[PDB]
Amino acid sequence: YILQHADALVKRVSKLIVNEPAARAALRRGVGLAPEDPRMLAAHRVVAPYVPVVHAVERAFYAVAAIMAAQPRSARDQRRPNLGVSLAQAVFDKGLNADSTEQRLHLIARQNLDGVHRHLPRLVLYLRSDQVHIDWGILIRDLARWGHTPRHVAREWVQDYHRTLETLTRQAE
Amino acid sequence: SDYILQHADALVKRVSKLIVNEPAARAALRRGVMLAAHRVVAPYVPVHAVERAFYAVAAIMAAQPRSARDQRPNLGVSLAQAVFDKGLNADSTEQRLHLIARQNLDGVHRHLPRLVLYLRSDQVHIDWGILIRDLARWGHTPRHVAREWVQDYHRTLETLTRQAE
Amino acid sequence: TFVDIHAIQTLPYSNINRDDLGSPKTVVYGGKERTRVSSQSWKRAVRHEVEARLGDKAVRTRRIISEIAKRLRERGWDADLADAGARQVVLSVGKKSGIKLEKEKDSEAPATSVLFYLPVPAIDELAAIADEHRDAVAKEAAKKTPKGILPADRITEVLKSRNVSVNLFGRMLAELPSTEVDGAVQFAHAFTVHGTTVEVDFFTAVDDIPKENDHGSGHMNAGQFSAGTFYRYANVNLDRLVENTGDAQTARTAVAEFLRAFLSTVPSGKQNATAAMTLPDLVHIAVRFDRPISFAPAFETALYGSDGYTLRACQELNNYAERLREVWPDDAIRGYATVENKTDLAALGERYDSYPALIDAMVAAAF
Amino acid sequence: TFVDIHAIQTLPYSNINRDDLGSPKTVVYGGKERTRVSSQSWKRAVRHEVEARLGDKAVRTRRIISEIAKRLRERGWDADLADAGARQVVLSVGKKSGIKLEKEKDSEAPATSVLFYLPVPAIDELAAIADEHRDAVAKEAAKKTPKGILPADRITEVLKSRNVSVNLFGRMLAELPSTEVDGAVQFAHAFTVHGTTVEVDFFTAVDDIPKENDHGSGHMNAGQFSAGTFYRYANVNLDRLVENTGDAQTARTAVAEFLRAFLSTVPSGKQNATAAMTLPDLVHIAVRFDRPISFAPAFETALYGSDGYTLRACQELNNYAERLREVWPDDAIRGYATVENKTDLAALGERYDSYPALIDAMVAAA
Amino acid sequence: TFVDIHAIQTLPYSNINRDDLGSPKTVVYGGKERTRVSSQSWKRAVRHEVEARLGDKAVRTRRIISEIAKRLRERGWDADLADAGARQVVLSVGKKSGIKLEKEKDSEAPATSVLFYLPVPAIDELAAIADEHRDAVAKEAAKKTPKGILPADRITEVLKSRNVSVNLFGRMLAELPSTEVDGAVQFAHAFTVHGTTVEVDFFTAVDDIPKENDHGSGHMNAGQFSAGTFYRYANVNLDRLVENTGDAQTARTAVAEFLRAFLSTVPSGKQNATAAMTLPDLVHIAVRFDRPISFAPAFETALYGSDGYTLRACQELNNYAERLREVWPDDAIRGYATVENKTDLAALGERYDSYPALIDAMVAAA
DNA sequence: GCCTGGCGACAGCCCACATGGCATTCCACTTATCACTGGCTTCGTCCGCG
DNA sequence: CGCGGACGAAGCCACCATGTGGGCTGTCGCCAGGC
């Protein structure tokens, strides 16, 4: 359901990065920190209207908007897959190292909600840095469900990653 | 903090009745913005932050202009409606809002009375009990309260723009 | 090889440097809040006084294309060819296709994404390089997506030219790492010796023509201000400044001029409403060879107050300078100059009667 | 056999060491957030000052092939033979076919996957080894997939050479476990004695050449800085440093030089914007024989504030040093040197007037 | 007959013990995640310090054949006879044909499937047993499938020899259940008193040669670290340690040495990058006769925070010790030693000025 | 005894800003290791111990 | 030499699926007058 507010946030913000600089620059200074942190007080003008009503959903929305605006200029310039499908696409196509990125994904899958946020911006900006595609609404919904799921979303992330890597390798034959 | 709120509401109606009924004690409260506040507000107390959170609001309530003096949303929505209804400038009241959200507990009491008395001057509704409790929760946790005000403010301003169209 | 200059300077209800909301910038240092003047501000005031006094000015601008366009337009180019030629100037250099540009604005040439920092005559030389190749520019101006025709080496050689300010404070250009220059000056954030609470000043703007049934002010607000005795510190790495300018004589003039600018200039923030133009109460130039040492820990314990902080700040900086010379022995050539004569301040080295005499003595002591 | 050095050092609005987003690194220690300077940074500053002062420099590089290529090119080799010879240098060693290389970059020699850490004259000796076999290299340069012709033993003996920095901090090479050296120094993460909230600093880069006299800047941002009195700690395992250098005299110079670097150096991260060059307020060198003990638990209870933390931090480190010497008895040779004279600080051992006098006394005591 | 030792010990940004992915090991205890140091790690650090201090070392190795081969080679055997003789050593014992061996590796003697755990002089005695029968070994070395010629009883008697570490921590050998020794020590997993979120540190190893154009980090990653006040607990079953060593005097030295190792040692996990060496803030040795009791339930309710956890952890362990002595009455000889003097901590028994004085008093009391 | 009312005099109104700006490159590792044991039958023979 | 314990002898069978929540608490203004 949340995927709806998530898609509205992804659209408006995806337009916001390209058209108005002061807004995305007001968004990127809040990457990876809880909304109570004073560096986030400037991001409420953009994000606060779109969150329904647990902090888990707010942290998902606010954080993905911040990671979304912190894309490098090159990335910003240019079925529904998860972040794991985006990972496997960055392994097979863009040539990222395999033993390390699989290790980093199975490293994310153990954190709690507090830890995922700590680890995610570095990984996502790594992925985004080489034009890997990531559907932000799915990542939002997933990050909102990370709080109440012990591993119910992460397992989906890991399974899809391994599976998509196997299929991408078998299609190359 | 639910128990802080009950005393805030009983103090609010007591002080409101005292403000409209007696000018001597009400003027005794407006001077602080101090012994008379100690002989008036003191019974309605359950940390130094909650006491200042009571005496400051009782003095601010007693300093209203008589237009506002004769006549649950918090202060972010009170500023948003003050923007939407009275036509009060939003770009500037937003800066005064973020400037309030940065201060600590002694500074929030340095910048609050001016904006609040400016709200009462425009006859905008301020739920005095919640503002009291929020100032009391401010010594306990400042960032949560400040963010709540900012988010609610920008959020109810947007909803009121959807209602406009 | 390290010239470091310390300075105590009081400012009276100045509010020279404001944050994003108008309040003066503060450090919670030593556990107590102390208003501060950011280093980039006083550094900007220093570079403008140095450029104005030494005559050569450098320009930090996001709009280099437009400026090259005025020079090509004064060289006889048509406005459209001047714009296309300046686009060729920024298009012909860098790893990628060209220096990226900000979104195009109506009627005006687009600003580069990053701030260029180059002397003025170098910008004019870029105009001459775009000028010699006028026909090739005219041919690429007709194409839909013109490419960088101008020679990259000549342009990169023009963009490497250094002003005194570039030699002194350094520059950074991410697309052209060949042009980056290491700064030779460390400029600390000037904070107060004592704890300072922000002082709110309510003010109103009078409406001059009066209308019946209204006396209200034309405007009302409440700006913020503060005052106090700031501690100031700065370094000059002589090895890097000599490496940047190349010759030791221009480095010598650059150092003496920098130190004088450090003493003379004031950031000019809100100065017309608050005339806070002031000379430092005490200055202490040390010429150290091993490493620079700021005396900022000396004022980590905030001063109590009620009495003038100048004498206690000078005396405290004296005791900390004495204790550091005992704890960390060195042959550094010291020297100071003070307004107050109530104390000798023995540890700050040889006393000089005037700031220019002190600067000349310590610069002459460093070559 | 263990020399450990403690130090209290205030830094004023420095922000010397930044995370990935620009904020200074923080520890939530004792329940309260405290900004920290990572050990890897101050260790790098220490190794560069030690190499610069002791004269011998080691090089941690991912691009060894390119550097060997400049030496072979200055020896008279053609550029293509210099590149093929340096590829032979890294191809001739290791278990597998060769040291694995990163994906090839246009116009430049490929970087090795792992960071080599070797002194500069050893790299030149690798160039000489690739030099005397020039004809064999020329023959393998013609083949499509040349093999490691150079002797592996000679190259592995060059890659085992140790700098003072290698002797002191150790190295790691996964493909050549014979070259790994155990570090002789434990360098702790310098955290603040007191709790510190990150200080946002709004800044603008004003744009010259105004367009229409409007004051709109060319840039606007907010970089976050912080200040405070850091606690610093470090160990030197004399048995391993003596084992690495071999002779006790070079280990003695290495230890004295390390301690002086520990006191003198500052990481230099964002210094031209905030000049944070400062000497430590207090230093306490202990020469312990049983085991090193950091006094970091002494500052687990964060200091309250409002008053200068230096005197209370020195006095608190004193009380914890006293209480540990009573609780854990030892014959360790202690000694300290301080700027403040307001207190005697009796537990920190014999007082010395200056940092070099203290270092010389405790190194001579070990 | 039960000596149990409790200890509160803070570690600053240590990350001493890592999981398989590099994160510090955590317990979700009391509903709140708390970083932990596994017992096997601190137990390994304790056994190495005990062996190093008491002089006798035991060896847990999968490659016993190769080591017996160096001893037979130094006794004058040919390399091939040394290898065949060591194979005879492991072939001559056990129910089945011999101790099962891992798949053969080129150029090296095969490792046994299970980890042997025996003192060093016992391995040398196994070499002597294989040595006396050199001609029989030479005859079986010529056959395609040689059988276990050596006497099984003599070898099994050598494999039964016990080190202090074997007496203290026990051993297990599935093929030779006669050699299994019951451990006399229960070592708990040291967890934090308070809830700890895993702190991430982002580091970048810098390339040293300057790039001509693009300067960037040589490698960049993020390693997880954490800090906190750990609770530590351990038991020593005096009846089993006396049963293992046999004589009460060696058991007495083993217990005193164990307790001192428990207090002194630190697992050494990235200690060269964190310097987590620290003495415990509080130690409490009880000599109980009925049964050992850990005070871990005392810290099941995680501490809130914002203030130093040491004083509250010591005071909470005090209240739980008091409440247990009232609820479960006993004549156990108690005793404690603390760094803080802010509290008397009456329930932890008689206070002693120093850790060695406490250990000597409670060991002498048992 | 309970409930209700009262305790010199304590001001009013008007007023609340516009505009502009918000960076960009680069870089992301290797190696080695990965347990055993048993939970069938009856009987006969051998070896060890007493 | 006798008894007890341990070991041995077989017969053995293999292109794409996921949604939930709600239960705990207390307070004045004081004194005097009248009913």
Question: Could you tell me if residue C94 is left (phi over 0), alpha (psi between -120 and 50 degrees) or otherwise beta?
Answer: left
**CA separation for the pair A151, A158 (Å, rounded):** 10
Residue of E nearest to C176 (CA): E213
Q: What is the DSSP letter of A50?
A: G
Best CA proximity match to D357, nearest among D297, D283, D302, D288: D283
Q: What residues are paired with C29 via a beta bridge? A: C32
| The token pair that represents C203 in the structure block | 């003010």
Given a contact cutoff of 8 angstroms between Cβ atoms, the answer to whether C311 and C343 are in contact is yes
Lookup result for tokens 């404001």: C18
Alpha carbon distance E308, E34 (integer Å): 17
Q: Which residue has the tokens 């024989």?
A: D289
Nucleotides of strand G lying closer than 7 angstroms to a protein CB: 7, 16, 18-19, 21, 23-29
Give the nucleotide with minimal C1' distance to the Cα of A1: G19
Residue B87, token pair as written in the block: 């036509």
DSSP for E23-59, please give it.
SBPEEEETTEEEEEE-HHHHHHHHHHHHHHHHS--EE
Whether chains E and C touch (3+ CB pairs under 8 A) is answered by: yes
Angle formed at CA B124 by CA B123 and CA B129, multiple of 5 degrees: 115
DSSP conformational letter for A59: H
In angstroms, rounded to a whole number, what is the distance separating the alpha carbons of residues D213 and C57? Answer: 20
DSSP code per residue over C114-158 = S-EEEEHHHHHHHHHHHHHTHHHHHHHHHSSS----S-HHHHHHH
> Is A151 in CB contact (< 8 Å) with chain E?
no
Rounded to whole angstroms, how far apart are CA atoms C288 and C285?
A: 9
The DSSP code for E211 is P
Nearest neighbour of E33 by CB, restricted to A107, A112, A118: A112
- Tokens 């929030």 belong to which residue? B108
**Residue E180: other Cβ atoms inside 10 A:** 12
Q: How far apart are the first and last CA of chain A?
A: 39
- The b/e string for A120-156 (b: 16+ C-beta within 10 A; e otherwise) is bbbbbbbbbeeebebbbbbbbbbbbbbbeeeeebbee
Kindly determine whether the C-beta of residue B1 is less than 7 Å away from any atom of nucleic acid strand G.
no
Record: contact B154-A37, CB cut-off 8 A: no
What do you get for the CA distance between the two ends of chain C, in Å?
Answer: 9
- Residues B92, C181: Cα–Cα separation, whole Å: 42
Q: How is residue B32 written in tokens?
A: 């602080």
Question: Which of A36, A37, A58 should we substitute to test contact with B (largest number of B Cβ atoms within 10 Å)?
Answer: A36
Give, in order, the Cα–Cα distances in Å from E261 to each of E10, E163, E284.
Answer: 17, 16, 15
Contact C230, C190 (CB under 8 A): yes
Q: Which residues of B touch A44 (CB under 8 A)?
A: 147, 150-151, 154-155
Per CB distance under 8 Å, which residues of C are interface residues toward E? 95, 177-178
The whole-angstrom separation of Cα C66 and Cα E272 is 55
Q: Answer positive or negative: Cα dihedral of E59, E61, E67, E68.
A: positive
- Residue for token digits 């863009």? A94
Helix ranges restricted to H, chain C: 39-54, 64-74, 79-91, 120-132, 134-142, 152-159, 164-169, 238-245, 248-264, 309-327, 355-366
Calculate the alpha carbon distances from E336 to B38, B51, D325, E210, E237 in Å. Answer: 51, 44, 17, 58, 20
The residue among E185, E235, E238, E182 whose CA lies nearest residue E1 is E238
DSSP H or E run through A73: helix A73-77
- Length D274 CA → F19 C1' (Å): 31
For residue E226, what is the DSSP state? -
Environment class of E364 (CB within 10 Å of its CB; exposed 0-12, middle 13-18, buried 19+): exposed
Task: Compute the distance between CA of residue E294 and CA of residue E297 in angstroms, rounded to an integer.
Answer: 8
Query: How far away is chain D from the Cα of C135, in angstroms, using its nearest Cα?
Result: 29
Can you name the residues that pair with D271 across neighbouring β-strands? none
How far: E346 CA to F37 C1' (Å)? 50
Paired strand residues for C351: C336
CB neighbours of D284 closer than 8 A, spacing ≥ 6? D5, D6, D7, D317, D321, D334, D335, D336, D348, D349
Q: C-alpha angle with apex E189: E186 to E194, nearest 5 degrees? A: 140
Residue A103: which of E21, E197, E200 has the nearest Cβ? E21
Dihedral Cα D108, D109, D115, D121, nearest 10 deg: -110
Nucleotide nearest to C22 (CA to C1'): F17
Determine the residue type at D35: T
User: How far is Cα B45 from Cα B136, in angstroms, rounded to an integer?
Assistant: 11
Q: What is the CA radius of gyration of chain B?
A: 16
Degrees, nearest 5: CA angle E333-E336-E337: 155
The torsion defined by the Cα of B15, B19, B23 and B24, in degrees rounded to 10, comes to 10
Copy the structure tokens of residue D209: 């050449």
d(CA C193, CA C229): 6
Query: Distance from residue C99 (CA) to nucleotide G20 (C1'), in Å?
Result: 52
CA distance D159 to D64: 12
E168 and D6 Cβ atoms separated by less than 8 Å: no
Q: Identify which of E311, E315, E309 has the alpha carbon closest to the alpha carbon of residue E196.
A: E309
User: Are D and A neighbours with ≥3 CB pairs closer than 8 A?
Assistant: yes
3-class DSSP assignment, residue D144: coil
For residue E346, count CB atoms less than 10 angstroms from its CB and return exposed for 0-12, middle for 13-18, buried for 19 or more.
exposed
Closest CA to C343 of C294, C310, C321: C310
- H or E, element range at E191: strand E190-192
Sequence-distant (≥ 6) Cβ neighbours of residue B95 within 8 angstroms = C21
- Taking alpha carbons only, the member of D282, D288, D298 closest to residue D352 is D282
Q: For residue E123, which amino acid is it?
A: I
Contact D/E (≥3 CB pairs under 8 Å): yes
State in Å, rounded, how far the first CA of chain D is from the last one: 7
CB E159 within 8 A of CB E94: no
Tokens of D62: 């991912």
CA–CA separation, C362 and C286 (whole Å): 7
Nearest Cα to Cα of residue A86 among A30, A125, A118:
A125
Chain A: give the shortest CA distance to residue E21, in Å.
6
How far is E228 from D300, CA to CA, in rounded Å? 9
D272/C32 touch (CB, cutoff 8 Å), yes or no: no
Q: CA–CA separation, B94 vs B152, rounded Å?
A: 12
Read off the amino acid at residue B123: Q
Half-sphere exposure of A125 (CA within 13 A, CB side): 20
Q: Are D181 and D17 in contact (CB under 8 A)?
A: no
Which window residues (104-123, chain C) lie with Cβ within 7 Å of strand F? 111, 113-115
For residue C100, CA distances in Å to C96, D283, E230 come to: 9, 51, 54
Record the tokens describing residue D218, joined without a space.
């060319």
SS (H, E, C) D162-229: CCHHHHHHCECCCCCCCCCECCCEEECCEEECECCCCEEEEEECCCCCCCCCCCCCCCEEEEEECCEE
**Distance in angstroms (rounded) separating the CA atoms of residues E89 and E63:** 13
**Helix residue ranges, H only, chain E:** 39-54, 64-74, 79-91, 120-132, 134-142, 152-159, 164-169, 238-245, 248-264, 271-274, 309-327, 355-365
What is the per-residue burial (b if ≥16 Cβ within 10 Å, else e) of D150-168?
Answer: beeebbeebbbebbbbbbb
User: Contact D199/C27, CB-based, under 8 Å?
Assistant: yes
- A55-69 vs A113-129: helix axis angle to the nearest 10? 20
Could you tell me which of E144, E145, E274 has the C-alpha nearest to residue E203? E274
Cα C35 from Cα C38, distance rounded (Å): 10
Contacting residues of D for A43, CB less than 8 Å apart: none
Cβ contacts (< 8 Å) between D40 and chain E: which residues?
Answer: 203, 273
A window 12-71: Cβ near strand F (< 7 A)? 21-22, 24-26, 28
The letter for the amino acid at D132 is E
State phi, psi for B74 to the nearest 5 degrees: -100, -155
Q: Are the C-beta atoms of B63 and B55 separated by less than 8 Å?
A: no
* Residue labelled with tokens 């099994």: E156
d(CA A48, CA B148): 10
Euclidean distance between CA atoms C170 and E77, whole angstroms: 72
Which nucleotide is nearest to E153 if distance is taken from CA to C1'? F48
Name D228's bridge partners.
D11
Any CB–CB contact under 8 A between A76 and chain D? no
What is the least distance, in Å, from the CA of C333 to any CA of chain D?
18
Q: Does residue B31 sit in helix, strand or coil?
A: coil
Closest among C142, C121, C131, C129 to C73, alpha carbons compared: C131
User: Å between D175 CA and F28 C1'?
Assistant: 19
Number of residues that this document lists for chain B: 165
Locate tokens 């103090």: which residue? B11
DSSP state of B47: -
Q: CA-CA distance, C44 to C165, in Å (whole number)?
A: 10
- All structural domains of chain B with their residue ranges: 1-165
Separation in Å, CA C135 to CA A148, C64, C131, E111, E254 = 68, 22, 9, 80, 94
The C-alpha atoms of residue C353 and residue C344 are separated, in whole angstroms, by 13
Q: How many other C-beta atoms lie within 10 A of the C-beta of residue D319?
A: 14
Question: Would an 8 Å CB–CB cutoff place C222 in contact with chain B?
Answer: yes
3-state secondary structure of E9: strand
* Bases in strand F with any atom closer than 7 Å to a protein CB: 9-32, 34-37
Interface partners of B (3+ CB pairs, < 8 Å)?
A, C
The DSSP secondary structure of D330-362, one letter per residue, reads: ---B--EEES--S---GGG-SB-SSHHHHHHHH
Cβ <8 Å between D21 and A39? no
SS3 label, residue E205: strand
**Least CB–CB distance from B102: residue in C21, C200, C222:** C21
CB proximity list for D212: less than 8 A, separation 6 or greater:
none
Resolution in A: 3.3
E97 touches strand F (CB under 7 A): no
Q: Which parts of C178-321 are beta strand (E)?
A: 185-187, 190-192, 199-205, 219-225, 228-237, 282-288
If you measure CA to CA, which chain E residue comes closest to A113?
E197
Neighbours of B118 (CB within 10 A): 15
> Most distant CA pair in chain A: distance in Å?
53
Nearest protein residue to nucleotide F14 (CA to C1' distance) is C216
How far apart CA C19 and CA C38 sit, in angstroms, is 10
Is residue A103 within 8 A of residue A143, CB to CB? The reply is: no
Query: What is the C-alpha R_g of chain A?
Result: 16
Cβ neighbours around C282 below 10 Å, total: 22
Instruction: Quote the minimal CA–CA distance from B13 to chain A in Å.
Output: 30
One-letter amino acid at C355 equals: Y
D209 CB below 7 A from strand F atoms: no
CB D253 within 8 A of CB D55: no
Angstrom distance, E102 CA to G14 C1': 27
d(CA A153, CA A143): 9
Q: Where are the beta strands (DSSP E) in chain D?
A: 2-11, 26-29, 32-37, 58-61, 116-119, 185-187, 190-192, 199-204, 220-225, 228-237, 282-288, 336-338
Q: Taking the CB of residue C209, how many other CB atoms lie within 10 A of it? A: 5
Q: Are residues E21 and A111, on separate chains, in Cβ contact within 8 Å?
A: no
Name the β-bridge partners of C8. C231, C282
Please provide the distance, in angstroms rounded to a whole number, between the alpha carbons at the two ends of chain E: 7
Dihedral (CA of D237, D242, D245, D249) sign:
positive
